Amino acid sequence: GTVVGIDLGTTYSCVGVFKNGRVEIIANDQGNRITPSYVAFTPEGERLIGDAAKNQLTSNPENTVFDAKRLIGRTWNDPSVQQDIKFLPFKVVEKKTKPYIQVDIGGGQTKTFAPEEISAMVLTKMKETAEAYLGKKVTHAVVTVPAYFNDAQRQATKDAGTIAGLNVMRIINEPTAAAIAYGLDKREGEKNILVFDLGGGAFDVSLLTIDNGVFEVVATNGDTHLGGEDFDQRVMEHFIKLYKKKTGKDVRKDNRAVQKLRREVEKAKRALSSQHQARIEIESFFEGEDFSETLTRAKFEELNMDLFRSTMKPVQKVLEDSDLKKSDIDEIVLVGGSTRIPKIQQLVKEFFNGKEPSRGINPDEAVAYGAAVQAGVLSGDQDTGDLVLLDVCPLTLGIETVGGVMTKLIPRNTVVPTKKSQIFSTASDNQPTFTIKVYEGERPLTKDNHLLGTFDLTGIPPAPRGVPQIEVTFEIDVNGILRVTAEDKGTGNKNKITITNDQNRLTPEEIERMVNDAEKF
Amino acid sequence: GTVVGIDLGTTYSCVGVFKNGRVEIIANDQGNRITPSYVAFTPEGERLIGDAAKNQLTSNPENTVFDAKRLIGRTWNDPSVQQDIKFLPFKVVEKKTKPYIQVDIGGGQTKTFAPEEISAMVLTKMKETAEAYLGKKVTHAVVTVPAYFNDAQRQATKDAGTIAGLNVMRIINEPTAAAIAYGLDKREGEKNILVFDLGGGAFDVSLLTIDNGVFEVVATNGDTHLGGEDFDQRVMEHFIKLYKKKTGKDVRKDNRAVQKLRREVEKAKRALSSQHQARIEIESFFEGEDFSETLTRAKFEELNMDLFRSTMKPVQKVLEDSDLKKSDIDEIVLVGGSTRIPKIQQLVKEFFNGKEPSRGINPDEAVAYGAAVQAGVLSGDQDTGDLVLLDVCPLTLGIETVGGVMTKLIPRNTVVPTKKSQIFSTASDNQPTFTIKVYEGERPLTKDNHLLGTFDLTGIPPAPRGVPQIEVTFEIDVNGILRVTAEDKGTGNKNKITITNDQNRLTPEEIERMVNDAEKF
Ligand SMILES: Nc1ncnc2c1ncn2[C@@H]1O[C@H](COP(=O)(O)OP(=O)(O)O)[C@@H](O)[C@H]1O
Ligand SMILES: Nc1ncnc2c1ncn2[C@@H]1O[C@H](COP(=O)(O)OP(=O)(O)O)[C@@H](O)[C@H]1O
Ligand SMILES: [K+]
Ligand SMILES: [K+]
CATH class of the missing domain: 3.90.640.10 (ATPase, substrate binding domain, subdomain 4)
Known part of the structure; x- marks a missing residue:
């Protein structure tokens, strides 16, 4: 159906759709264009997702779940997980070497959720937000992840989407999605893009190159606990x-x-x-x-x-890791709500000696925007190819006229089978004979073209030069066989040659070289 | 250099060489195509090898040495050795548990020779025979041994060759060499080969199988003192x-x-x-x-x-040891001079109910012949590999044309990097848009192929269907990146897609399955 783009964020998630020529960022049932990546289980056994989970006043913070993205696709003994569980107010436990989130779902009934099951609930909320706007079922999504996410983290994110009822067609990198939102994929040359992503929970700096359609993440840095x-x-x-x-x-x-x-x-x-x-x-x-x-x-x-000052060091590090100078940065992309802070904008502009960042897309929607653009391209996968293959002459076919001139009968890229004729005459008074030399090639003089065969037309009646009308016809049949006829229209006197592929066929290497001289005359 | 094949025989030795497309069995300086496996020490201290040793009239048979092959690679207390020394007219003695041949080399001066030292003298004679014919040094040999020879016997034979100045590249089994001489390795199916080898001193029957290039010696029998x-x-x-x-x-x-x-x-x-x-x-x-x-x-x-009648019992025994019936024998190979005896040929033909043996190679040269064939193959080990690896497209690349048809731009096994183009047109009058769907696969309909990406070409000027000429180009660069362009040749309007490996790369398992449908159309 229609494919959505989802920014599955550490603290906030955002859903867009390419519809009727434009990206729409979709407001949730609370009217918010971003949704907290939050799930809460109430004592009465109700489940809250998004604004209701985050904005829920409770004396028990232990059954409100957030920051699942810090745990998704990781092993229990990952030092990142061992660090993160210290500050998280909900219980995280090991089961078969993986971290699980442990909550009271109602009346002291304990359940353990995989991080991707919590993220599946957030993606369900984003799906429903999109479904309410479109008034149709959403089955397919492009979902973004941090550039540094490994295969396990990308697969667990895919799995979150699958559980939420989404076919996750593509996982794409957050900084790349932001670059795509700003149209930076649709530009010529090698450009260096610095993506500065200061969100609610984490700071990510990425150096991307765009070169002739290919994106490369060259270096990443930042601070996982600065937002x-x-x-x-x-x-x-x-x-x-x-x-x-x-x-x-x-x-x-x-x-x-x-x-x-x-x-x-x-x-x-x-x-x-x-x-x-x-x-x-x-x-x-x-x-x-x-x-x-x-x-x-x-x-x-x-x-x-x-x-605020600490955000400059990671920028310095990605520049040296990518072996670039400040001046080598062609594009600065600000991503994340926190980039709206004037002191942050000032510190980045000053670091880059007054260079202006990209402007026009809300920094907290830009990743969803790029995902939505990419979703738009992939929704075209169910279109039908409305092209017809043409069978065409690969090289100009013609005859030698006075001065060793290539006179075309069948131009290169003429649809075959075909029949084309021109009228020729004598170069001298009472000329009795024509010699028809059949050439293939794009060069104006037949010395530089490929000779296919020759035949004569004899018994041309006496007349002043240019008076007799000899019709030369080139015919390519359904078998690609070339037949050339010369007929004196005065008399019906005619002769013909059938040109065979055998032993005077050019190689595709020779053809390519001749095609180089096409479109000169 | 040139590798020779040597039959190091119990009573006669034979040397061949694969030269200029043919096996030549080489005559010695006496004009004989076989050489007695004989060494003689004269009272004046001269050493005779081959015909001169055997044909030497003497009142003292004790310093003429033969049947070294009965002793080679064996221990003194081997019951075969204890049996054999009883009838041998020369002195055999134990030194450090191994049998040595004791002779007067001149004027009552006693020397003890290892069996492999006697065989080294016979192999020196065969080397010299080959060197005289070729007019160059012979450095390398394939040497044959009985199928029943153990590792010690094979190594002692190798050692005989080393002492004679030969690099013994391969030790191969006598019956296998005879089979190779008759071309029985170069045939399809599972064939059962009975090799009947009646030489001067011993009778060897071998059941070999040949199956898809592999020889197996299934069973052996015979009589070590019947020739x-x-x-x-x-x-x-x-x-x-x-x-x-x-x-x-x-x-x-x-x-x-x-x-x-x-x-x-x-x-x-x-x-x-x-x-x-x-x-x-x-x-x-x-x-x-x-x-x-x-x-x-x-x-x-x-x-x-x-x-003569006693030769049938060992044949019976190898048939039951191989669990075969007479009728299961696909090939009878006669080896050894004694198989020229008509009564022996009759007894074998009758045993096998009139089945004809292989014919065309002298039975006393067949083992040397096969060794020479094998030597010929191994002389190719100093050749140079004159192959160039091609970098090629593993799967056909193309676009969808009307009816969901796979229209190829780059056939499978096209050399890369490459650039290939075809001309396409509209399916309808005044068609304003093309949808270019890029597919990989060998199937005629794109529903059965792998979608790589889609893009549009917009703003096609009005014309009757089939009139506009849109050139579609597929380009694979030195990095194996596929770029597809569609250009309206009428206007220069064009669009492009760059196809990346990421997330829509087929696995080598998937490719193998698709390659199964190659070469159908
Ligand atoms: N105008 C603003 N000024 C300052 N901070 C803002 C502003 N708007 C949003 N933010 C902050 O942005 C953060 C959320 O970042 P966002 O990019 O939406 O997603 P994520 O946290 O998932 O990366 C929150 O800390 C929020 O308060
Ligand atoms: N035409 C023949 N008729 C009978 N016996 C023959 C004939 N030619 C050779 N022989 C015998 O073959 C024996 C030698 O066997 P051969 O296969 O040459 O080598 P080896 O004894 O080393 O196995 C001798 O007994 C010799 O007399
Ligand atoms: K976000
Ligand atoms: K022999």
Whole structure:
């Protein structure tokens, strides 16, 4: 059917579709063009996906699942997994050497989910978002993954899609999808593309080359634990301390309160990408006490400046790993919501001596956008080939006229079988004979063409030069046999040659060389 | 250099060479195509090899050495050795558990020779025979051994050759060499070959199978003390008795006289394979008395009939040991001089219910002949490989034309890199668009082939169907990357796809299955 493009993100997922000449990024049933990569199991046994899972206020953070993408396709003893489980608030356990997420699904009933089963639930939500917009079933998808993902990680992502009811036609790299969204695949020459992807949870820098249709990921770097959520956490520590100082109320260890503030902090952060002040207000925040503070851009930047500056080192490293200078970068692509932060845009522009990044696609939708473009191309796989093969003459066929001139009867690329005729005459008064020399080739003089045969037409009646009309006909039959006739239209006197393939057939090497001189005259 | 084939025989040795398309069996300096496996040390300290050693009249048979092949590669306490030394007229002694031949080499000076040192002297004679014919040094040989020879016996034979200055490239079995001489290796199916080898000293019957290039020796039997020399000895006992009766002269215990008669008896025996009477005459045979008797075939047969009949039991035994019936024998190969005896040929033909043996190679040269054929094959080991590897397209590449038809642009096994083009047109009047679907596979309909990608060519100007000329080009570059272009030759409007290996590459298992349908159309 119609193929969708899905950005299956660490913190947010996005679905697009190429429809009626345009990429549409599809809003979910909450009206959001991105969906949290979140699943929550309630004590009553209800399952929440997306905004409802993330925005769910609970005193128990242990049955809310996120960051499945950190675990997908990995073994338990992967040092990345052993690091990650330390900070994840839900239980991760080993079963037959693989990490499983352990939750209470209802009334103390424990279940273990594979990371790809959690991601399958997120992809089900993205599928349904697309199905609501299109008003038809979605069966096929292009799904993106980080460039550094190995085969096990790509297959587990495929498996997530399969479980969600999607035929995952292609897994493509996130930075490549962003490049495709910006049309950078459709350009001539060797271009160097720096993709700077600062999302909610991770920072990924990729050096891609585009050369004559081929994308190569040359080098990757970044920080797997640096994203927008770390900036939120700096604002959080600050406002928790400030609230404690102003009211004596310590909101830490009350998860419900932490969630309400974190959500307001995240909205304020986004506002500070457009303006220099933002109000955080929560009516009855903590025991009838309202929350009311404002955050300046300067304070937001001050609380995070070390984290913002740290994004430049991975850029430096991919440049040296790709053996490129700053000036060798033809294209800067900003990906991820956090690239909307003016200080981040400033730090990247300054690093690249004032070079402007690509602009026009929302940075948190660009990967989904590129996936949707690629999905559009692959939806054409069910089209029908509406081409007819033509049988054509591979070389110009003609005769020698006075001065050793190649006079064409059947131009190269004439559809065969065919019959073509021209009228010829005498070069001298009372000329009694014609010699018809049949040539193959594209050169204007027959000395440079291939002789196929000769015959005479005798008994031309007396007349002044140019008066007799001799019709020369070239006929190629359904068997590709060439027959040449010369007939005196005055008398009906005629002669013919049948030209055979035997022993005076050019090799396809010889033909290619002759075809080089085609389209000169 | 040129490799020779040597039959190192119990009683006679034979050397051949594959030269200028033919096996030549090489005559020695006496003009004989076989050479006695004999060495003699004269009282004056001269060493004789071949005909000169055997034909040497002496009153001392103790310093003439033969039958080294009975001892080669064996231990002193081998029951075969303990049996054999009883009848051998030269001294055999034990040194460090191995049998040595002890002779007077000159003036009462004793020397002990390893059996392989005696065989090395015979192989030196065969090497020199070959060198005289070729007029160049012979460095390499294939040497034959009985099928029943163990590793020690094969190595001691190799060692004999090494001592004689030969690189013994291969030791091959006598019956296999005879089969090879008769071309029985170069035939289809499973064939059963009975090799009947009656030489001067031993009888060997071998059941070989030939199956798809592989020879197996399935069973062997025979009699190690039954050969032409036993037939000679029956004629000898008869004529010694007859001479004693007619003259009172007893030639026994006069070795010189015994030798002269034995030599005449052997020539008469050979004549009786071609005619039914033979004259034995020796002028001044014993004290001025001439010898003059004739021998009939009937008397020769009568004196030996029990020995001739005894050759059938070993044939019976190899048939039951190989679990075959007479009728299962596809090929009878007669080897050894004694197979020229008509009564022996008759007994074998009758045993096999009138089946004809192989014919055309002298039975006493057939083993050398096969060795020479094998030598010919191994002389090719110093040739140079004059092949160039081609880089070729493993599967047909093309596009879908109307009706879901696979229209090839690059046939399977086209040399790459390459560029191939065909001309296509519209299926309908004023058709505005082409869809180019790029397929890989050998099947005539693209539903059964592998889709590599699709692209469109838009903006085809109005014309009647079949009039526009769209050139489709398939290009495989030095990196094996496929690029497909479609260009409207009318306008220069064109589009292109670059096809990557990633995620739509067939497995070598899938390719093999598709290649099964190659060469159908
Ligand atoms: N205007 C904005 N200013 C600052 N951060 C933003 C803005 N919009 C979104 N973000 C942040 O972007 C992050 C999400 O990144 P995104 O690219 O959507 O996906 P992912 O986290 O899956 O890579 C969150 O931390 C979010 O707060
Ligand atoms: N025409 C023949 N008739 C009978 N016996 C023959 C004939 N030619 C050769 N022989 C015998 O063949 C024997 C030699 O066998 P041969 O195959 O040459 O080698 P080997 O003894 O080494 O196996 C001798 O006994 C010789 O007399
Ligand atoms: K995302
Ligand atoms: K022999």
